[PDB]
C-alpha cells in the first residue's frame, strides 16, 4: 500500500511541475486521496484494494 | 429502489388496456395502476432509465434496448 | 415526446450533476465534455 | 496535495460533518473533486458595488432581448418572402401548410432559446447575490460563469 501512495505522490509532483491541464491534476489528487484512505482503512469507502 | 410494477409493464410495451384486461381479477393491481402517475410506454421508459442508470443522460435507443439486454439476451 | 421536452430536459440536466462515487466512472464521464478534433483543427492547434 | 484522514471524514457519525455542518454526501463530493465549495465571500465589497452589477446585468439582458427581437423580425420577414413564390402557383393547402408550420416552429425555437438564456442569466444573478461561504456549487459551468 505504501508503495502505491509514493508512486502517486511522485506522479502528482511531475504533473504540477510541467503544468498539466487541471483535469489531470485533479484526477491525480483524487487518486492520492483514495490511496491514502485505503492505506489507513482499506475497503471503508469503496471496493477494497 | 422499489417502484410500482405498472411502470415496468408499460415500459415492456403494454398500453393501459391490456393490464386491465389481464389483471382484472385483483384489486391491488388496480390500486397500483390508478396510483401510477406515469402515462404511456415512453414515460415509463425514461423513468426506468433514469433510475437504473442515473449517471449517463437518457437517450431513446438506449432506453428502448435497456430491458432487452438486461434479461432477454 | 422524447425530444426538447421539459421532462427530458430535466432528466438530462439531473444526470449531469450526479456524484458518480466510482472513480473510473467519474473520470470517464468528465473527459466526454470535449468533442473530438478533425484533421485541420489539429494542425491549427 | 493535502488529504483528509478517513477516520474523521466518515465514521458514522462524520466528525468533519458535525464540525462544519456539511452533510456527508455533500462533504464527500468536495473531498473527491466532484463539486466546488465557497471558502470566503466579501460581503463589504459586494455591498459597495451592488447597483453597478445590477446595471451591468440589465444591459446584458436588454442586449439579449434586442437580439431575440431582431431574430424574430428577420425570420418573420423570411416567412412573408416564402409566401410570394408559393402562392402564385395554385397549389393545395399542403404547399402552404408546410411553410406555415416551419415558420411557426422557427418562431417558437427562437423564442424559447432566448427564454432559456434569460432563465440561465437570472439563475447566475440569484446565485451570486445569495453567495455565502460553505456553499456547494455542483454545476461546473455555473461556477465558471461566477
Swiss-Prot record, chain B:
Oligomeric and partner information: The RNAP catalytic core consists of 2 alpha, 1 beta, 1 beta' and 1 omega subunit. When a sigma factor is associated with the core the holoenzyme is formed, which can initiate transcription. Interacts with RbpA, which partially restores Rif-inhibited transcription.
Other comment: Mutations in the RRDR sequence (residues 423-449) confer rifampicin (Rif) resistance. Rif blocks transcription initiation but not elongation.
Tree of life domain: Bacteria
Species in which this protein is naturally found: Mycolicibacterium smegmatis (strain ATCC 700084 / mc(2)155)
General function of this protein: DNA-dependent RNA polymerase catalyzes the transcription of DNA into RNA using the four ribonucleoside triphosphates as substrates. This subunit often mutates to generate rifampicin (Rif) resistance. Interaction with RbpA partially restores Rif-inhibited transcription; once the subunit is Rif-resistant however RbpA no longer stimulates transcription.
Protein name: DNA-directed RNA polymerase subunit beta
Family: Belongs to the RNA polymerase beta chain family.
Curated annotation (Swiss-Prot), chain D:
Protein family membership: Belongs to the RNA polymerase beta' chain family.
The protein's assembly and partners: The RNAP catalytic core consists of 2 alpha, 1 beta, 1 beta' and 1 omega subunit. When a sigma factor is associated with the core the holoenzyme is formed, which can initiate transcription.
Function: DNA-dependent RNA polymerase catalyzes the transcription of DNA into RNA using the four ribonucleoside triphosphates as substrates.
The protein's name in its UniProt record: DNA-directed RNA polymerase subunit beta'
Species this chain originates from: Mycolicibacterium smegmatis (strain ATCC 700084 / mc(2)155) (Mycobacterium smegmatis)
Record lineage: Bacteria, Bacillati, Actinomycetota, Actinomycetes, Mycobacteriales
